[PDB]
Amino acid sequence: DSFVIRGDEVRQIAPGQTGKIADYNYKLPDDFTGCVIAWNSNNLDSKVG
Amino acid sequence: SALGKLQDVVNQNAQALNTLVKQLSSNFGAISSVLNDILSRLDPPEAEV
């Protein structure tokens, strides 16, 4: 599964989390088996304006 | 006190049932002894614990 989120929201991509990305964008189950790999992509996804 | 042998058996069974029923009021480390209050207040990730 792949997506772009804000850095403060990286912690929400985990089982048992609450917020806007967890409760409304990408909810993970509590018995989730897997890995949440994430990296800073400011050099790819940022624009001046 | 002549029929104490039979009364003692009745009393022991009554105490055993009263003890078993009273154990439902114990929290056992949970936030509440009432299962309905836990399910009314919590979502599954905390309610299951």
PDB file of N, CA and C in Angstrom:
ATOM      1  N   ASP A   1       0.859  -1.175   0.000  1.00  0.00           N
ATOM      2  CA  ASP A   1       0.000   0.000   0.000  1.00  0.00           C
ATOM      3  C   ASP A   1       0.899   1.230   0.000  1.00  0.00           C
ATOM      4  N   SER A   2       0.566   2.228  -0.811  1.00  0.00           N
ATOM      5  CA  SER A   2       1.445   3.383  -0.943  1.00  0.00           C
ATOM      6  C   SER A   2       0.667   4.687  -0.982  1.00  0.00           C
ATOM      7  N   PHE A   3       1.220   5.701  -0.299  1.00  0.00           N
ATOM      8  CA  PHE A   3       0.618   7.031  -0.197  1.00  0.00           C
ATOM      9  C   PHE A   3       1.635   8.037   0.346  1.00  0.00           C
ATOM     10  N   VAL A   4       1.299   9.322   0.210  1.00  0.00           N
ATOM     11  CA  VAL A   4       2.052  10.448   0.771  1.00  0.00           C
ATOM     12  C   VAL A   4       1.299  11.060   1.945  1.00  0.00           C
ATOM     13  N   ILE A   5       1.979  11.221   3.086  1.00  0.00           N
ATOM     14  CA  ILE A   5       1.403  11.915   4.233  1.00  0.00           C
ATOM     15  C   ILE A   5       2.393  12.935   4.783  1.00  0.00           C
ATOM     16  N   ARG A   6       1.891  13.743   5.709  1.00  0.00           N
ATOM     17  CA  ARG A   6       2.681  14.718   6.443  1.00  0.00           C
ATOM     18  C   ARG A   6       3.503  14.002   7.513  1.00  0.00           C
ATOM     19  N   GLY A   7       4.701  14.541   7.788  1.00  0.00           N
ATOM     20  CA  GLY A   7       5.638  13.897   8.711  1.00  0.00           C
ATOM     21  C   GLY A   7       5.094  13.633  10.105  1.00  0.00           C
ATOM     22  N   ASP A   8       4.313  14.580  10.648  1.00  0.00           N
ATOM     23  CA  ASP A   8       3.712  14.401  11.969  1.00  0.00           C
ATOM     24  C   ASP A   8       2.696  13.274  11.988  1.00  0.00           C
ATOM     25  N   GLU A   9       2.200  12.884  10.824  1.00  0.00           N
ATOM     26  CA  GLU A   9       1.160  11.891  10.707  1.00  0.00           C
ATOM     27  C   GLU A   9       1.754  10.509  10.492  1.00  0.00           C
ATOM     28  N   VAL A  10       3.094  10.418  10.373  1.00  0.00           N
ATOM     29  CA  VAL A  10       3.761   9.132  10.142  1.00  0.00           C
ATOM     30  C   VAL A  10       3.490   8.168  11.294  1.00  0.00           C
ATOM     31  N   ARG A  11       3.436   8.700  12.519  1.00  0.00           N
ATOM     32  CA  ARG A  11       3.099   7.911  13.698  1.00  0.00           C
ATOM     33  C   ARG A  11       1.688   7.335  13.641  1.00  0.00           C
ATOM     34  N   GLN A  12       0.778   7.948  12.878  1.00  0.00           N
ATOM     35  CA  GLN A  12      -0.579   7.420  12.810  1.00  0.00           C
ATOM     36  C   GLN A  12      -0.688   6.137  11.998  1.00  0.00           C
ATOM     37  N   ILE A  13       0.313   5.801  11.182  1.00  0.00           N
ATOM     38  CA  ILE A  13       0.238   4.593  10.362  1.00  0.00           C
ATOM     39  C   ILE A  13       0.650   3.393  11.212  1.00  0.00           C
ATOM     40  N   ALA A  14      -0.145   3.073  12.222  1.00  0.00           N
ATOM     41  CA  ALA A  14       0.170   1.992  13.140  1.00  0.00           C
ATOM     42  C   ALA A  14      -1.141   1.423  13.657  1.00  0.00           C
ATOM     43  N   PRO A  15      -1.141   0.182  14.156  1.00  0.00           N
ATOM     44  CA  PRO A  15      -2.354  -0.345  14.796  1.00  0.00           C
ATOM     45  C   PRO A  15      -2.713   0.446  16.047  1.00  0.00           C
ATOM     46  N   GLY A  16      -4.012   0.625  16.269  1.00  0.00           N
ATOM     47  CA  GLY A  16      -4.451   1.257  17.496  1.00  0.00           C
ATOM     48  C   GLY A  16      -4.280   2.756  17.576  1.00  0.00           C
ATOM     49  N   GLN A  17      -4.184   3.449  16.448  1.00  0.00           N
ATOM     50  CA  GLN A  17      -3.966   4.887  16.445  1.00  0.00           C
ATOM     51  C   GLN A  17      -5.255   5.628  16.115  1.00  0.00           C
ATOM     52  N   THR A  18      -5.293   6.889  16.533  1.00  0.00           N
ATOM     53  CA  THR A  18      -6.406   7.792  16.289  1.00  0.00           C
ATOM     54  C   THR A  18      -5.897   9.087  15.675  1.00  0.00           C
ATOM     55  N   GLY A  19      -6.807   9.783  15.003  1.00  0.00           N
ATOM     56  CA  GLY A  19      -6.498  11.033  14.348  1.00  0.00           C
ATOM     57  C   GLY A  19      -7.272  11.180  13.060  1.00  0.00           C
ATOM     58  N   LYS A  20      -6.693  11.837  12.067  1.00  0.00           N
ATOM     59  CA  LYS A  20      -7.384  12.116  10.816  1.00  0.00           C
ATOM     60  C   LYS A  20      -7.034  11.123   9.720  1.00  0.00           C
ATOM     61  N   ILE A  21      -5.752  10.784   9.623  1.00  0.00           N
ATOM     62  CA  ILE A  21      -5.276   9.757   8.704  1.00  0.00           C
ATOM     63  C   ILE A  21      -5.678   8.359   9.145  1.00  0.00           C
ATOM     64  N   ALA A  22      -5.568   8.055  10.436  1.00  0.00           N
ATOM     65  CA  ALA A  22      -6.072   6.771  10.905  1.00  0.00           C
ATOM     66  C   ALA A  22      -7.591   6.670  10.834  1.00  0.00           C
ATOM     67  N   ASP A  23      -8.314   7.562  11.515  1.00  0.00           N
ATOM     68  CA  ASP A  23      -9.765   7.394  11.512  1.00  0.00           C
ATOM     69  C   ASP A  23     -10.458   7.729  10.193  1.00  0.00           C
ATOM     70  N   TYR A  24      -9.783   8.330   9.210  1.00  0.00           N
ATOM     71  CA  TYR A  24     -10.451   8.804   7.990  1.00  0.00           C
ATOM     72  C   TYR A  24      -9.688   8.557   6.702  1.00  0.00           C
ATOM     73  N   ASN A  25      -8.395   8.248   6.717  1.00  0.00           N
ATOM     74  CA  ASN A  25      -7.712   8.008   5.452  1.00  0.00           C
ATOM     75  C   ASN A  25      -7.150   6.598   5.314  1.00  0.00           C
ATOM     76  N   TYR A  26      -6.303   6.126   6.248  1.00  0.00           N
ATOM     77  CA  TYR A  26      -5.707   4.787   6.127  1.00  0.00           C
ATOM     78  C   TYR A  26      -5.705   4.058   7.478  1.00  0.00           C
ATOM     79  N   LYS A  27      -6.835   3.453   7.827  1.00  0.00           N
ATOM     80  CA  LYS A  27      -6.953   2.709   9.074  1.00  0.00           C
ATOM     81  C   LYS A  27      -6.311   1.326   8.972  1.00  0.00           C
ATOM     82  N   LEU A  28      -5.444   0.993   9.938  1.00  0.00           N
ATOM     83  CA  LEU A  28      -4.860  -0.343  10.051  1.00  0.00           C
ATOM     84  C   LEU A  28      -5.550  -1.171  11.130  1.00  0.00           C
ATOM     85  N   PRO A  29      -5.754  -2.465  10.876  1.00  0.00           N
ATOM     86  CA  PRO A  29      -6.351  -3.340  11.890  1.00  0.00           C
ATOM     87  C   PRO A  29      -5.389  -3.593  13.041  1.00  0.00           C
ATOM     88  N   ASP A  30      -5.958  -3.967  14.184  1.00  0.00           N
ATOM     89  CA  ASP A  30      -5.151  -4.171  15.383  1.00  0.00           C
ATOM     90  C   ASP A  30      -4.327  -5.450  15.333  1.00  0.00           C
ATOM     91  N   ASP A  31      -4.729  -6.423  14.518  1.00  0.00           N
ATOM     92  CA  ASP A  31      -3.996  -7.670  14.342  1.00  0.00           C
ATOM     93  C   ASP A  31      -3.151  -7.644  13.076  1.00  0.00           C
ATOM     94  N   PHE A  32      -2.779  -6.439  12.643  1.00  0.00           N
ATOM     95  CA  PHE A  32      -1.994  -6.220  11.435  1.00  0.00           C
ATOM     96  C   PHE A  32      -0.643  -6.915  11.490  1.00  0.00           C
ATOM     97  N   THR A  33      -0.312  -7.618  10.413  1.00  0.00           N
ATOM     98  CA  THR A  33       0.998  -8.225  10.240  1.00  0.00           C
ATOM     99  C   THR A  33       1.604  -7.567   9.013  1.00  0.00           C
ATOM    100  N   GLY A  34       2.759  -6.949   9.181  1.00  0.00           N
ATOM    101  CA  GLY A  34       3.342  -6.203   8.087  1.00  0.00           C
ATOM    102  C   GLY A  34       4.340  -5.187   8.594  1.00  0.00           C
ATOM    103  N   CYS A  35       4.841  -4.399   7.653  1.00  0.00           N
ATOM    104  CA  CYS A  35       5.844  -3.382   7.951  1.00  0.00           C
ATOM    105  C   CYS A  35       5.428  -2.043   7.354  1.00  0.00           C
ATOM    106  N   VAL A  36       5.598  -0.986   8.141  1.00  0.00           N
ATOM    107  CA  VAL A  36       5.311   0.389   7.736  1.00  0.00           C
ATOM    108  C   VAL A  36       6.642   1.086   7.468  1.00  0.00           C
ATOM    109  N   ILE A  37       7.056   1.040   6.208  1.00  0.00           N
ATOM    110  CA  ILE A  37       8.265   1.686   5.714  1.00  0.00           C
ATOM    111  C   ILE A  37       7.931   3.097   5.241  1.00  0.00           C
ATOM    112  N   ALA A  38       8.703   4.087   5.673  1.00  0.00           N
ATOM    113  CA  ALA A  38       8.390   5.468   5.334  1.00  0.00           C
ATOM    114  C   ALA A  38       9.696   6.233   5.199  1.00  0.00           C
ATOM    115  N   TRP A  39       9.687   7.240   4.326  1.00  0.00           N
ATOM    116  CA  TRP A  39      10.867   8.072   4.132  1.00  0.00           C
ATOM    117  C   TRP A  39      10.489   9.497   3.758  1.00  0.00           C
ATOM    118  N   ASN A  40      11.359  10.433   4.133  1.00  0.00           N
ATOM    119  CA  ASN A  40      11.182  11.834   3.775  1.00  0.00           C
ATOM    120  C   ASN A  40      11.369  11.994   2.273  1.00  0.00           C
ATOM    121  N   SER A  41      10.402  12.639   1.623  1.00  0.00           N
ATOM    122  CA  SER A  41      10.432  12.842   0.179  1.00  0.00           C
ATOM    123  C   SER A  41      10.326  14.312  -0.207  1.00  0.00           C
ATOM    124  N   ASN A  42      10.866  15.204   0.638  1.00  0.00           N
ATOM    125  CA  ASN A  42      10.802  16.648   0.395  1.00  0.00           C
ATOM    126  C   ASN A  42      11.445  17.022  -0.936  1.00  0.00           C
ATOM    127  N   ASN A  43      12.520  16.331  -1.311  1.00  0.00           N
ATOM    128  CA  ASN A  43      13.195  16.603  -2.573  1.00  0.00           C
ATOM    129  C   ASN A  43      12.408  16.116  -3.785  1.00  0.00           C
ATOM    130  N   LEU A  44      11.350  15.324  -3.593  1.00  0.00           N
ATOM    131  CA  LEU A  44      10.542  14.851  -4.709  1.00  0.00           C
ATOM    132  C   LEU A  44       9.148  15.450  -4.751  1.00  0.00           C
ATOM    133  N   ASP A  45       8.534  15.688  -3.597  1.00  0.00           N
ATOM    134  CA  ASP A  45       7.126  16.049  -3.525  1.00  0.00           C
ATOM    135  C   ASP A  45       6.878  17.523  -3.245  1.00  0.00           C
ATOM    136  N   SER A  46       7.902  18.301  -2.912  1.00  0.00           N
ATOM    137  CA  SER A  46       7.711  19.711  -2.600  1.00  0.00           C
ATOM    138  C   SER A  46       7.882  20.603  -3.825  1.00  0.00           C
ATOM    139  N   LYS A  47       7.114  21.688  -3.836  1.00  0.00           N
ATOM    140  CA  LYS A  47       7.172  22.741  -4.838  1.00  0.00           C
ATOM    141  C   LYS A  47       7.208  24.058  -4.081  1.00  0.00           C
ATOM    142  N   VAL A  48       7.690  25.114  -4.756  1.00  0.00           N
ATOM    143  CA  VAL A  48       7.887  26.409  -4.101  1.00  0.00           C
ATOM    144  C   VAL A  48       6.558  26.991  -3.632  1.00  0.00           C
ATOM    145  N   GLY A  49       5.530  26.939  -4.474  1.00  0.00           N
ATOM    146  CA  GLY A  49       4.293  27.573  -4.068  1.00  0.00           C
ATOM    147  C   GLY A  49       3.421  26.643  -3.261  1.00  0.00           C
TER     148      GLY A  49
ATOM    149  N   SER B   1     -30.031 -27.842  67.098  1.00  0.00           N
ATOM    150  CA  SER B   1     -28.862 -28.211  66.310  1.00  0.00           C
ATOM    151  C   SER B   1     -28.763 -29.704  66.005  1.00  0.00           C
ATOM    152  N   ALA B   2     -29.880 -30.435  66.037  1.00  0.00           N
ATOM    153  CA  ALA B   2     -29.807 -31.887  65.891  1.00  0.00           C
ATOM    154  C   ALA B   2     -29.528 -32.286  64.446  1.00  0.00           C
ATOM    155  N   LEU B   3     -30.147 -31.590  63.491  1.00  0.00           N
ATOM    156  CA  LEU B   3     -30.029 -31.879  62.065  1.00  0.00           C
ATOM    157  C   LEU B   3     -28.907 -31.092  61.400  1.00  0.00           C
ATOM    158  N   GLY B   4     -27.866 -30.741  62.163  1.00  0.00           N
ATOM    159  CA  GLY B   4     -26.746 -29.965  61.649  1.00  0.00           C
ATOM    160  C   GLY B   4     -26.021 -30.561  60.456  1.00  0.00           C
ATOM    161  N   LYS B   5     -25.995 -31.894  60.346  1.00  0.00           N
ATOM    162  CA  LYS B   5     -25.326 -32.548  59.217  1.00  0.00           C
ATOM    163  C   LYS B   5     -25.952 -32.172  57.875  1.00  0.00           C
ATOM    164  N   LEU B   6     -27.275 -32.001  57.830  1.00  0.00           N
ATOM    165  CA  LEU B   6     -27.932 -31.672  56.568  1.00  0.00           C
ATOM    166  C   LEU B   6     -27.889 -30.171  56.325  1.00  0.00           C
ATOM    167  N   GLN B   7     -28.025 -29.406  57.413  1.00  0.00           N
ATOM    168  CA  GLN B   7     -28.027 -27.956  57.323  1.00  0.00           C
ATOM    169  C   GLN B   7     -26.657 -27.466  56.892  1.00  0.00           C
ATOM    170  N   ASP B   8     -25.597 -28.143  57.350  1.00  0.00           N
ATOM    171  CA  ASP B   8     -24.240 -27.762  56.980  1.00  0.00           C
ATOM    172  C   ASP B   8     -24.022 -27.929  55.483  1.00  0.00           C
ATOM    173  N   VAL B   9     -24.597 -28.986  54.894  1.00  0.00           N
ATOM    174  CA  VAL B   9     -24.470 -29.225  53.458  1.00  0.00           C
ATOM    175  C   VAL B   9     -25.203 -28.138  52.684  1.00  0.00           C
ATOM    176  N   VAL B  10     -26.411 -27.790  53.153  1.00  0.00           N
ATOM    177  CA  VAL B  10     -27.202 -26.731  52.524  1.00  0.00           C
ATOM    178  C   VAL B  10     -26.461 -25.400  52.612  1.00  0.00           C
ATOM    179  N   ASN B  11     -25.861 -25.121  53.775  1.00  0.00           N
ATOM    180  CA  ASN B  11     -25.138 -23.872  53.988  1.00  0.00           C
ATOM    181  C   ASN B  11     -23.894 -23.810  53.113  1.00  0.00           C
ATOM    182  N   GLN B  12     -23.171 -24.932  52.976  1.00  0.00           N
ATOM    183  CA  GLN B  12     -21.950 -24.943  52.173  1.00  0.00           C
ATOM    184  C   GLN B  12     -22.275 -24.680  50.713  1.00  0.00           C
ATOM    185  N   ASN B  13     -23.387 -25.244  50.226  1.00  0.00           N
ATOM    186  CA  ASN B  13     -23.742 -25.020  48.828  1.00  0.00           C
ATOM    187  C   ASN B  13     -24.220 -23.588  48.624  1.00  0.00           C
ATOM    188  N   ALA B  14     -24.968 -23.051  49.599  1.00  0.00           N
ATOM    189  CA  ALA B  14     -25.430 -21.670  49.515  1.00  0.00           C
ATOM    190  C   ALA B  14     -24.249 -20.705  49.522  1.00  0.00           C
ATOM    191  N   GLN B  15     -23.242 -20.973  50.367  1.00  0.00           N
ATOM    192  CA  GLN B  15     -22.056 -20.123  50.415  1.00  0.00           C
ATOM    193  C   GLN B  15     -21.275 -20.218  49.116  1.00  0.00           C
ATOM    194  N   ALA B  16     -21.176 -21.427  48.545  1.00  0.00           N
ATOM    195  CA  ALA B  16     -20.439 -21.611  47.297  1.00  0.00           C
ATOM    196  C   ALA B  16     -21.090 -20.821  46.169  1.00  0.00           C
ATOM    197  N   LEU B  17     -22.430 -20.850  46.111  1.00  0.00           N
ATOM    198  CA  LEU B  17     -23.137 -20.102  45.077  1.00  0.00           C
ATOM    199  C   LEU B  17     -23.025 -18.605  45.317  1.00  0.00           C
ATOM    200  N   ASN B  18     -23.117 -18.175  46.580  1.00  0.00           N
ATOM    201  CA  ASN B  18     -23.021 -16.753  46.883  1.00  0.00           C
ATOM    202  C   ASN B  18     -21.629 -16.227  46.565  1.00  0.00           C
ATOM    203  N   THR B  19     -20.594 -17.032  46.837  1.00  0.00           N
ATOM    204  CA  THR B  19     -19.221 -16.644  46.533  1.00  0.00           C
ATOM    205  C   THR B  19     -19.018 -16.523  45.031  1.00  0.00           C
ATOM    206  N   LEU B  20     -19.558 -17.490  44.277  1.00  0.00           N
ATOM    207  CA  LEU B  20     -19.415 -17.496  42.825  1.00  0.00           C
ATOM    208  C   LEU B  20     -20.090 -16.270  42.226  1.00  0.00           C
ATOM    209  N   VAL B  21     -21.294 -15.952  42.706  1.00  0.00           N
ATOM    210  CA  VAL B  21     -22.032 -14.808  42.188  1.00  0.00           C
ATOM    211  C   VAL B  21     -21.337 -13.496  42.567  1.00  0.00           C
ATOM    212  N   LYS B  22     -20.836 -13.395  43.809  1.00  0.00           N
ATOM    213  CA  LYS B  22     -20.133 -12.190  44.259  1.00  0.00           C
ATOM    214  C   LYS B  22     -18.847 -11.950  43.480  1.00  0.00           C
ATOM    215  N   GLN B  23     -18.241 -13.005  42.916  1.00  0.00           N
ATOM    216  CA  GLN B  23     -17.029 -12.802  42.119  1.00  0.00           C
ATOM    217  C   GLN B  23     -17.277 -11.957  40.866  1.00  0.00           C
ATOM    218  N   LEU B  24     -18.532 -11.832  40.409  1.00  0.00           N
ATOM    219  CA  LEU B  24     -18.848 -11.012  39.243  1.00  0.00           C
ATOM    220  C   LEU B  24     -18.713  -9.521  39.517  1.00  0.00           C
ATOM    221  N   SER B  25     -18.625  -9.118  40.781  1.00  0.00           N
ATOM    222  CA  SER B  25     -18.479  -7.723  41.169  1.00  0.00           C
ATOM    223  C   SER B  25     -17.020  -7.315  41.277  1.00  0.00           C
ATOM    224  N   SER B  26     -16.104  -8.246  41.046  1.00  0.00           N
ATOM    225  CA  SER B  26     -14.674  -7.996  41.120  1.00  0.00           C
ATOM    226  C   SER B  26     -14.180  -7.454  39.787  1.00  0.00           C
ATOM    227  N   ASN B  27     -13.219  -6.534  39.851  1.00  0.00           N
ATOM    228  CA  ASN B  27     -12.676  -5.956  38.630  1.00  0.00           C
ATOM    229  C   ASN B  27     -11.607  -6.829  37.994  1.00  0.00           C
ATOM    230  N   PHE B  28     -10.823  -7.551  38.807  1.00  0.00           N
ATOM    231  CA  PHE B  28      -9.700  -8.394  38.366  1.00  0.00           C
ATOM    232  C   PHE B  28      -8.655  -7.591  37.590  1.00  0.00           C
ATOM    233  N   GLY B  29      -8.550  -6.298  37.887  1.00  0.00           N
ATOM    234  CA  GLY B  29      -7.620  -5.407  37.232  1.00  0.00           C
ATOM    235  C   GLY B  29      -8.233  -4.591  36.118  1.00  0.00           C
ATOM    236  N   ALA B  30      -9.472  -4.884  35.737  1.00  0.00           N
ATOM    237  CA  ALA B  30     -10.164  -4.135  34.704  1.00  0.00           C
ATOM    238  C   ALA B  30     -10.651  -2.798  35.251  1.00  0.00           C
ATOM    239  N   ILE B  31     -10.968  -1.884  34.328  1.00  0.00           N
ATOM    240  CA  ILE B  31     -11.493  -0.577  34.707  1.00  0.00           C
ATOM    241  C   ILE B  31     -12.873  -0.666  35.347  1.00  0.00           C
ATOM    242  N   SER B  32     -13.625  -1.736  35.093  1.00  0.00           N
ATOM    243  CA  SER B  32     -14.958  -1.883  35.654  1.00  0.00           C
ATOM    244  C   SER B  32     -15.325  -3.357  35.692  1.00  0.00           C
ATOM    245  N   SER B  33     -16.071  -3.736  36.728  1.00  0.00           N
ATOM    246  CA  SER B  33     -16.603  -5.088  36.842  1.00  0.00           C
ATOM    247  C   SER B  33     -17.779  -5.337  35.913  1.00  0.00           C
ATOM    248  N   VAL B  34     -18.365  -4.288  35.345  1.00  0.00           N
ATOM    249  CA  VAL B  34     -19.547  -4.398  34.502  1.00  0.00           C
ATOM    250  C   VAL B  34     -19.098  -4.440  33.051  1.00  0.00           C
ATOM    251  N   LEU B  35     -19.418  -5.547  32.379  1.00  0.00           N
ATOM    252  CA  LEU B  35     -18.998  -5.765  30.998  1.00  0.00           C
ATOM    253  C   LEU B  35     -19.664  -4.769  30.055  1.00  0.00           C
ATOM    254  N   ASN B  36     -20.927  -4.430  30.340  1.00  0.00           N
ATOM    255  CA  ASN B  36     -21.680  -3.492  29.517  1.00  0.00           C
ATOM    256  C   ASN B  36     -21.078  -2.096  29.558  1.00  0.00           C
ATOM    257  N   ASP B  37     -20.520  -1.684  30.701  1.00  0.00           N
ATOM    258  CA  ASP B  37     -19.920  -0.355  30.787  1.00  0.00           C
ATOM    259  C   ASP B  37     -18.649  -0.285  29.955  1.00  0.00           C
ATOM    260  N   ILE B  38     -17.858  -1.364  29.965  1.00  0.00           N
ATOM    261  CA  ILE B  38     -16.645  -1.424  29.157  1.00  0.00           C
ATOM    262  C   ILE B  38     -17.000  -1.371  27.678  1.00  0.00           C
ATOM    263  N   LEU B  39     -18.024  -2.129  27.267  1.00  0.00           N
ATOM    264  CA  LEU B  39     -18.381  -2.134  25.851  1.00  0.00           C
ATOM    265  C   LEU B  39     -19.040  -0.824  25.436  1.00  0.00           C
ATOM    266  N   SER B  40     -19.754  -0.174  26.358  1.00  0.00           N
ATOM    267  CA  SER B  40     -20.357   1.124  26.087  1.00  0.00           C
ATOM    268  C   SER B  40     -19.316   2.230  25.986  1.00  0.00           C
ATOM    269  N   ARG B  41     -18.212   2.120  26.724  1.00  0.00           N
ATOM    270  CA  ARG B  41     -17.221   3.189  26.744  1.00  0.00           C
ATOM    271  C   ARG B  41     -16.079   2.991  25.760  1.00  0.00           C
ATOM    272  N   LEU B  42     -15.598   1.767  25.582  1.00  0.00           N
ATOM    273  CA  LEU B  42     -14.407   1.511  24.789  1.00  0.00           C
ATOM    274  C   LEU B  42     -14.708   0.860  23.447  1.00  0.00           C
ATOM    275  N   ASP B  43     -13.796   1.082  22.510  1.00  0.00           N
ATOM    276  CA  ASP B  43     -13.701   0.468  21.198  1.00  0.00           C
ATOM    277  C   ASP B  43     -12.888  -0.815  21.335  1.00  0.00           C
ATOM    278  N   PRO B  44     -13.009  -1.767  20.390  1.00  0.00           N
ATOM    279  CA  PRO B  44     -12.320  -3.103  20.508  1.00  0.00           C
ATOM    280  C   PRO B  44     -10.836  -3.102  20.877  1.00  0.00           C
ATOM    281  N   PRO B  45      -9.955  -2.196  20.373  1.00  0.00           N
ATOM    282  CA  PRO B  45      -8.521  -2.300  20.758  1.00  0.00           C
ATOM    283  C   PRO B  45      -8.228  -2.201  22.255  1.00  0.00           C
ATOM    284  N   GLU B  46      -9.091  -1.559  23.032  1.00  0.00           N
ATOM    285  CA  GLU B  46      -8.919  -1.417  24.470  1.00  0.00           C
ATOM    286  C   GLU B  46      -9.910  -2.292  25.209  1.00  0.00           C
ATOM    287  N   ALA B  47     -11.094  -2.448  24.603  1.00  0.00           N
ATOM    288  CA  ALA B  47     -12.140  -3.249  25.208  1.00  0.00           C
ATOM    289  C   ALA B  47     -11.697  -4.694  25.304  1.00  0.00           C
ATOM    290  N   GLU B  48     -10.969  -5.206  24.294  1.00  0.00           N
ATOM    291  CA  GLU B  48     -10.557  -6.610  24.328  1.00  0.00           C
ATOM    292  C   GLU B  48      -9.607  -6.876  25.489  1.00  0.00           C
ATOM    293  N   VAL B  49      -8.745  -5.907  25.807  1.00  0.00           N
ATOM    294  CA  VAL B  49      -7.822  -6.044  26.930  1.00  0.00           C
ATOM    295  C   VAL B  49      -8.596  -6.089  28.245  1.00  0.00           C
TER     296      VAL B  49
END
